[PDB]
Amino acid sequence: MASMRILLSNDDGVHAPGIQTLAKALREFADVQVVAPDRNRSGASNSLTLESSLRTFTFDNGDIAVQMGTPTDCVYLGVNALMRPRPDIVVSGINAGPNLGDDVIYSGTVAAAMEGRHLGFPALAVSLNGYQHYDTAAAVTCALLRGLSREPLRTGRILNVNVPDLPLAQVKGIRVTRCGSRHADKVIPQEDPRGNTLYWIGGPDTDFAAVDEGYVSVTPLHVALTAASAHDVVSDWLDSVGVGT
Amino acid sequence: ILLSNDDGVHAPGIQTLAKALREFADVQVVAPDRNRSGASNSLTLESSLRTFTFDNGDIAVQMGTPTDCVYLGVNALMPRPDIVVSGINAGPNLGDDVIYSGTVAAAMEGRHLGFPALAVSLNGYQHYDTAAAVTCALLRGLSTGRILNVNVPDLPLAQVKGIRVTRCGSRHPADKVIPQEDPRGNTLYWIGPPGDYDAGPDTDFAAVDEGYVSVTPLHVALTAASAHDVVSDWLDSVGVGTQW
Ligand SMILES: [Mg+2]
Ligand SMILES: [Mg+2]
């Protein structure tokens, strides 16, 4: 029953209908602090903005927008400075458009969640497979948060949630999925004065399939980029050709 | 060699590397037509990407991503390269940022396509020669399915101490959040170390602090660590589809 501290961010910026819908739904049963970008960051790199002062705007309701802040900037500032006591969880969304595939790491929605993966509860990244039923997506997120406060799930990770763009009553249920994959298939030029020649035009368990079949898709993600297997197969490769003239 | 980057075909880091590498190896430059450090690094999956070709051979993909430059370079524009390299970046690529880095991304498209790949970055602004020298030394190797991720101190080559096989950190422990004001009184926040330290003994972060070339074997993480049943059981135990 008790009040969970939620850091809410996104990719689409403080004004987006997705984050503002979710925030209203969440403020009914949780303490919500919005720290989001000052603009829509679709197509924009994610990174922590280091050693460069970030200006902070405060809205009437207390939402805060970070001037030129990436989704990771917002999460970093929210976790370490802007939400006191420190948030229990980071929620990122609701994003306008899906976040499916192995390409999700390059998305700002996932990136914000990823930045909040070390908190008390695993981070949620929430995307709507469209632009209409934010209500459905906000409902699915609430169910998830209630569940986490009931029986906690292991931290250090994120759940990537994709919600079909459907009325709540038409959603068939929730599946635990794994990410899909979309991609040599390059084509030919067609410029009117032939300005250039070199051109391009570039599973039953995948997240794509569950969403297409009308289900909420939940993919558990973690970041691990090193093998102890690689660490010394290049270390003995380095000490092979050491210092010498 | 296919040489690309994140900061553009005219970038100092890539030009200094392409010149130093043209000593030992043959290089084909395919890089974005503009600085992309602020742009997303995914492939542009369903559009027609124009290319520009300079007198020296260099190719610039118009509005290209760093991965686009590797994909479009290999399977459409360039004999097949021996090693795909991602030019000397202006600025570090340390810890969590490697997931987000355009420089790292370009190397990643390389090994997905099935090539050896190198990504290199300068922790500063001045000593591209130092970084080029380090890369040339490294490329001079016996001439893993993982990319090396290399970070170089911004020092004259003679001031550089060693070379460390490192792993990635998350975020630097020394990087704190420091509240500030501007002359207008606006509230501002500054992320980073107030001076000097305390980094993980084996991390990419640590090496650079101590004047050492960080080299990390790398592969991006979209895995679950087979934690699919852990969550599957969690949705059954707690009512998540109940209230509808
Ligand atoms: Mg977005
Ligand atoms: Mg760059």
Numbering used by the authors:
A (entry chain A): -2 to 180, 182 to 200, 209 to 251
B (entry chain B): 3 to 80, 82 to 146, 152 to 204, 206 to 253
Paper text:
SurE is one of the several proteins that gets expressed when bacterial cells are subjected to environmental stresses and in the stationary growth phase of bacteria. SurE has been shown to possess phosphatase activity and appears to be specific to nucleoside monophosphates. The StSurE protomer has a Rossmann fold like structure similar to those of its thermophilic homologs.
Examination of the sequences of this segment in StSurE and PaSurE suggested that D230 and H234 of StSurE might be the key residues responsible for C-terminal helix swapping. The double mutant D230A/H234A had no detectable activity (<0.1%). Comparison of the thermal melting profiles of the wild type and mutant SurEs suggests that the double mutant with a broad melting profile might represent a larger ensemble of structures in solution. Examination of electron density map and geometry of the model revealed that as in H234A, in D230A/H234A mutant also, the C-terminal helices are largely swapped. The final model for D230A/H234A consists of 245 residues in chain A, 244 residues in chain B, 230 water molecules, two glycerol (cryo-protectant) molecules and two magnesium ions. In D230A/H234A, the segment 147–151 of chain B is disordered probably due to its proximity to the C-terminal helix. The loss of D230/OD2 - H234/NE2 hydrogen bond also leads to a large shift in the position of a loop near the active site pocket such that the mutants can no longer bind phosphate required for activity.
